[PDB]
Paper text:
Pyridoxal 5’-phosphate phosphatase (PDXP), an enzyme that controls levels of pyridoxal 5’-phosphate (PLP), the co-enzymatically active form of vitamin B6, may represent an alternative therapeutic entry point into vitamin B6-associated pathologies. PDXP is a member of the large family of haloacid dehalogenase (HAD)-type hydrolases. HAD phosphatases are Mg2+-dependent phospho-aspartate transferases that consist of a Rossman-like catalytic core linked to a cap domain. 7,8-DHF binds and reversibly inhibits PDXP with low micromolar affinity and sub-micromolar potency.
7,8-DHF-bound murine PDXP co-crystallized with phosphate in the cubic space group I23, with protomer A containing the inhibitor and protomer B representing an inhibitor-free state. 7,8-DHF was observed to only bind to one subunit (the A-chain) of murine PDXP with well-defined density and full occupancy since its average B-factor of 45.8 Å2 closely matches the B-factors of the surrounding atoms. Binding to the other subunit (B-protomer) is prevented by a salt bridge between Arg62 and Asp14 of a symmetry-related A-protomer in the crystal. To allow binding of the inhibitor, the side chain of Arg62 needs to adopt a completely extended conformation, which is prevented by the salt bridge. However, preventing mPDXP salt bridge formation by mutating Asp14 to Ala did not alter the efficacy of 7,8-DHF inhibition (see also Figure 3d for the characterization of the PDXP-Arg62Ala variant). Due to the limited solubility of 7,8-DHF, we were unable to address the stoichiometry of 7,8-DHF binding to the PDXP dimer with isothermal calorimetry. It is conceivable that the mPDXP crystal packing is very stable (indeed, 7,8-DHF-bound mPDXP crystallized in the same cubic space group as apo-mPDXP, see Kestler et al., 2014, including the aforementioned salt bridge between Arg62 of the B-subunit and Asp14 of a symmetry-related molecule), and that the free energy generated by the formation of the crystal lattice is higher than the free energy generated upon inhibitor binding. The Cα atom-based alignment of the structures representing murine apo-PDXP and murine 7,8-DHF-bound PDXP resulted in root mean square (RMS) deviations in the range of 0.43–0.71 Å. The inhibitor localization in the presence of phosphate was identical in human and murine PDXP. Inhibitor binding in the presence of phosphate is identical in human and murine PDXP and appears to be primarily stabilized by two hydrogen bonds, as well as polar and non-polar interactions.
Numbering used by the authors:
A (entry chain A): 0 to 291
B (entry chain B): 1 to 101, 107 to 291
């Protein structure tokens, strides 16, 4: 029913987890912040696994391709996870591009990427050719906007030149407007760079990352997931919680990240139903009281 | 000193009653090819209903954990968890991740072995795009083994910092028709000889396979029954880990080979107990 931003504890926690077949975790602000894990996060994943609960992971962070992201999980103390459980915006972008650019061998094209090496590596793993890689650059058939620490006026100009070709696709990893750093400062997100590309090119980007439903499609392509039996746990109302509502999942806001309980309750008072979490917890460690 | 005694009657009830769990080898114990050992699914059921933990080891490096879990279910073993399955492929992937904590791994092996390494976050030589420095060579069961591939492996091993790992040293494996196929131990011997290197072996009887289990589960070896069909791998493994060993006769090794080891004083290759098949163990449960 309508979300009420209720604190998940006691019987409500036991019932919700007991009926759930799996949990879908956002990563940044949920499992960790920078190099600091959320206390109790590794133990939660273990007890979820021993309870027969499936776990999957989403993230709009495109800094690490799947191999390095799996190494990060293991290094930070999350054991027993498999790389195929990890669904970043980089992975989903590579899938979409592969799906859309699959065709005659003589007509494969190249992807112009505004983003970092991890994003480039994820596209290469999918078989995509990248503009700027060694050797002649084939016809650019798509522009991909991601988190780009090297964003520049000249490369923005170059992306838009490619987009003058109406057959050149425009894809964005996500629309996150900004991201918090350890020192309290903020960094602009793909949403800010996408707004620049979209405005200068007059185009609408295809967005793969949450809250876009495509990110869930990527999961369902690999795993049988009953959304009505899946908990969506995230820290950002405008991405994770909206994502859950669009996919029909029960949404849980954790307060270890971007969004606050006051922001959530403000959405409820305004009747903005799809941005109101069904439940909330101080941290995902609070969920362990519903197991054993 | 083990005496390879037929486990039956009261001894069977005492042994199973005191055990917290059973560690099963897979090939030759639970099945042979696509033909399950009669009564094997029922045994696992009754073990579960008795509160007995069950774990599974295998030097078979052909199947990644998901496909191995599917195999169990397809053959009639229900209610098992992928976290209970410890193949040499899985343990090899874990060792390489630790040692390389990354570079890329040149794999002499099949898709299941490659998939297991990819699932652990390791990059593989020959995969699309990234061309990292090869920091390890992994030898597994490789039906594509060739002179050219052996030559490539040795070229990487000219770098003294490139690790050499082998999934196991099983010399050969039996097929349904009575024929045999060369095992990883034969291919590792070629790689080791041509490179002048000694390989790190993860699979039983190497103790690392047990380290992989104990990292995931609290296992008291003194209360665990190691059930296998191969004296030189399963039984030796059990002795090295301090487990009570049970030889089943549905697989590679014979009771005469076991009694030959007892006559020669090779304690670590003599099973503590033996059964014609693991179905005989069901009589100690109720
Ligand atoms: O997509 C990215 C998201 C983030 C991020 C930073 C702080 C909090 C949450 C997410 O950082 C990145 C980064 O540092 C890179 O080098 C490349 C990509 C990303
Ligand atoms: Mg987040
Ligand atoms: Mg065997």
């Amino acid at each position: 029913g309508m979300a009420r931003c209720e604190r998940l504890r006691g019987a409500a926690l036991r019932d919700v987890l007991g009926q759930a077949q799996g949990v879908l975790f956002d990563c940044d602000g949920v499992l960790w912040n920078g190099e600091r894990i959320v206390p109790g996060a590794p133990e939660l994943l273990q007890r979820l696994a021993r309870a027969g609960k499936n776990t999957l992971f989403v993230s709009n962070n495109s800094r690490r391709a799947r191999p390095e992201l799996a190494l990060r999980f293991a290094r930070l103390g999350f054991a027993g996870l498999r790389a195929e459980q990890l669904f970043s915006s980089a992975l989903c972008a590579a899938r979409l591009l592969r799906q859309r650019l699959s065709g005659p061998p003589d007509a494969s094209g190249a992807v112009f990427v505004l983003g970092g090496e991890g994003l480039r590596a994820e596209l290469r793993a999918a078989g995509l050719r990248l503009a700027g890689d060694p050797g002649e650059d084939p016809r650019v058939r798509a522009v991909l906007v991601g988190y780009d620490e090297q964003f520049s006026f000249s490369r923005l100009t170059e992306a838009c030149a490619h987009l003058r070709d109406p057959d050149c696709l425009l894809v964005a990893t996500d629309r996150d407007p900004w991201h918090p750093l350890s020192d309290g400062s903020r960094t602009p997100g793909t949403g800010s760079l996408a707004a620049a590309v979209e405005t200068a090119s007059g185009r609408q980007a295809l967005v793969v990352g949450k809250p876009s439903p495509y990110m869930f499609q990527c999961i369902t392509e690999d795993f049988s997931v009953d959304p009505a039996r899946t908990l969506m746990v995230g820290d950002r109302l405008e991405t994770d919680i909206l994502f859950g509502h669009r996919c029909g999942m029960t949404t849980v806001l954790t307060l270890t990240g971007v969004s606050s309980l006051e922001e959530a309750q403000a959405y409820l008072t305004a009747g903005q139903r799809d941005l109101v979490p069904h439940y909330y917890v101080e941290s995902i460690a609070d969920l362990m009281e519903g197991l054993e």
